[PDB]
Amino acid sequence: XSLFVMKDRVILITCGTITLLNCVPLICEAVSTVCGEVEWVSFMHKNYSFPWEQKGPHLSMAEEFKTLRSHFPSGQPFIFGPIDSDHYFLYFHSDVVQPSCSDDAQLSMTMYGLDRNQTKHWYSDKMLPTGPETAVIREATGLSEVVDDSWILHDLQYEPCGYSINAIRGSEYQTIHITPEEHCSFASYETNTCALNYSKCICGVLRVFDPERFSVIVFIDPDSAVGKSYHSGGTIGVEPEYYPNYEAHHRTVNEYTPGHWVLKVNYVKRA
Amino acid sequence: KDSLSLMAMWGSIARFDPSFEGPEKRLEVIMRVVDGTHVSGLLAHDDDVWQKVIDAICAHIVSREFNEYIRSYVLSE
Amino acid sequence: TRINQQTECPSSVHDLVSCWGSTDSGLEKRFELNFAQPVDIGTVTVKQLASVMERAGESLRQNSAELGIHTLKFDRSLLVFTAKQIVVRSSVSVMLHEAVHPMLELMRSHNIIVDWASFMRVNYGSPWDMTSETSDIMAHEYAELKSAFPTGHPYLAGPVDRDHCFYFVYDGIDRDPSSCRRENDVQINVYMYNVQEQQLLVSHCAGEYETLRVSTHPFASFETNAVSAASDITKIVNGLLKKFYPERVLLVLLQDRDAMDRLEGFTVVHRGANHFGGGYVFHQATYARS
Ligand SMILES: NC(=[NH2+])c1cccc(/C=N/N/C(N)=[NH+]/N=C/c2cccc(C(N)=[NH2+])c2)c1
């Protein structure tokens, strides 16, 4: 995958073995043409399920670090969570010379071991852009509830399997990407929606997939709605109480840069 | 390879079973606005600009949707 | 300029290291075992603990016996042994991971069940500095630790390219309602980089201690498990910063299952927490002199 272009930023999401970092020079150029100045760059990815197949700088976190350091020398890498299990790698660069107001939001989900009754609908022997066929898939699986009529959506059913969808509503966006193969079942969800509590958003996604395990990472800005709630002892929708069928295995909290926080939680389904 | 990536590999090996890479890479760039910044920001560019960006990573756009705040593109290898 | 090499998956962590894998940049290593049941202070002898540390290249030089504590001092390491835990802290030239398996065998020979263990190193440099051996050592440390505790996991608290703690935690604590394994431990660690040589232990209560190691770029390392320390971390750190006056500081505070905002003249570099599934939390913050 997805490319979200906004007034003040770009968000490029890719999967497979695509060498994402190759497009940094052109993004920098795209900012200089309109007379902008890069102030904030983040590179992030859930740990790869098959790291030995990644190419270019992505074959190791040291290579991703060195590559990003060659362009953003002051950036800093982080690893959140168990390194030999579910975790996130983050590289963060910032050149904020003029203090501003940070009220954005970011909610990402990674899900594995998807419902077997659902994976049936993510298969297809032909390529299908957004049309009547995909509408059947969205209703047959439950994506219609996550992406209701108030969103502008456009999806793609892959051949032989694979599903992607992008949704937008005003300045907010929503994206999902599904890999339904039984032996490597995976699904992803991301959104920048403002919400005082993500439980219903998250549970809505879990109802579709009902995964064996999943991770949720939440970037909290100081001046956002969820930010004020989090910094006042309030629940934000990722606490264990909202997932009785799941057991929290590990959780991390990091102020990666002053005033900005990130929360990650790994959930494993109970027996 | 480095020890940290070595640990991450062993965790993936223990979950391996003889395979597409679902987990994604995410890049985000936010720019500052100056006096001479285009009033439309990055939205001033046409789809020509963003298509050349996707070419750098050896992908292509399959569909497009835009509104008054955001341009959305679906990509495929 | 790469090609694909169809090869076998290593069947063990040791095969992965040898096949797919300046001096060590860390400042201190720390190895800890906790027991499913408290251990008679005297059942494990000083001789047996010393033979374990011989596997890591350390020779016993001094040892003292106190109420609920046995202290063993080596050339580059300090070992504390109480009824609830064994904790050894050493310089980075000590291959402390070589004592993991022998130490576990010793516990095994005494019918002592280890249900929680940790291996921790405090680094100033990044493990991705290829001119250094830090990465090769950490890979060997991981081999021994993961080989002994397949259920354990490694973690990296803090910026990988700045002051941070890499630690490995195995949690096999039996938490069945009918279990008598309570978790109200205190652990507070203060690492002080570039201060302005000794290994000391001070005991104020039975089974509770304060240890201080000073070594080398001079650095001092303070640890305590005293319940009284958990009520006033602010006071003790200020006394340490005054006596040592370091450039950078790294704090670690344990919040056990049964239960740091600003330092004088120091700016916060990083702040974070690792909440383990077992309910306990490890809090960490790094600081740099203003
Ligand atoms: N938007 C995206 N970039 C995206 C999002 C989510 C999943 C996928 C992958 N689909 N493909 C999957 N899940 N499995 N592999 C299918 C396959 C099998 C044999 C051959 C080929 C091929 N075209 N070479 C693909 C792609």
Residue numbers in the entry:
A (entry chain B): 86 to 356
B (entry chain A): 5 to 22, 27 to 85
C (entry chain F): 4 to 24, 32 to 206, 219 to 238, 243 to 285, 294 to 324
Provide passages from the article that reported this PDB entry:
AdoMetDC is a pyruvoyl-dependent enzyme that catalyzes formation of decarboxylated AdoMet, a substrate required for biosynthesis of the polyamine spermidine from putrescine. The AdoMetDC pyruvoyl group plays a key role in the catalytic mechanism and derives from an autocatalytic processing reaction that cleaves the peptide backbone into β- and α-chains. Trypanosomatid AdoMetDC undergoes this cleavage, while the corresponding pseudoenzyme, which we call ‘prozyme’, lacks key residues and is not processed to the active form.
TbAdoMetDC/prozyme wild-type heterodimer was crystallized with putrescine both in the absence (apo-TbAdoMetDC/prozyme) and presence (CGP-TbAdoMetDC/prozyme) of CGP 40215 (CGP), a known AdoMetDC inhibitor. The CGP-TbAdoMetDC/prozyme structure additionally has CGP bound in the active site and a second putrescine (Put) found in a novel site near the N-terminal α-helix (h1). Comparison of CGP-TbAdoMetDC/prozyme heterodimer with the apo-TbAdoMetDC/prozyme structure shows that conformational changes upon ligand binding are limited to the movement of a couple of residues in the flexible connector arm (e.g. R26) adjacent to h1 and the active site. In the presence of ligand R26 repositions to form an interaction with the π electrons in the benzamidine ring of the inhibitor. CGP binds in the TbAdoMetDC active site with one amidine group buried 3.6 Å above the active site pyruvoyl group. CGP forms H-bonds with the backbone carbonyl of L83, the side chain hydroxyls of S249 and Y243, and with C100, suggesting C100 may be unprotonated leading to formation of an ion pair with the amidine of the inhibitor. The buried benzyl ring is sandwiched between Y243 and F28 forming π-π stacking interactions with the former and the guanidine group nitrogens (N01 and N03) form a bidentate H-bond with E266. The amidine of the second benzamidine group is solvent exposed. Furthermore, the active conformation is likely stabilized and perhaps regulated by pathway metabolites since putrescine is bound in the h1 helix pocket forming H-bonds with both h1 residues and residues forming the h1 binding pocket, such as H172. The fully activated T. brucei enzyme has a conformation and active site structure similar to the human enzyme however two residues within the 4 Å CGP 402015 inhibitor contacting surface differ between the human and T. brucei structures (TbR26/HsH5 and TbY243/HsF223).
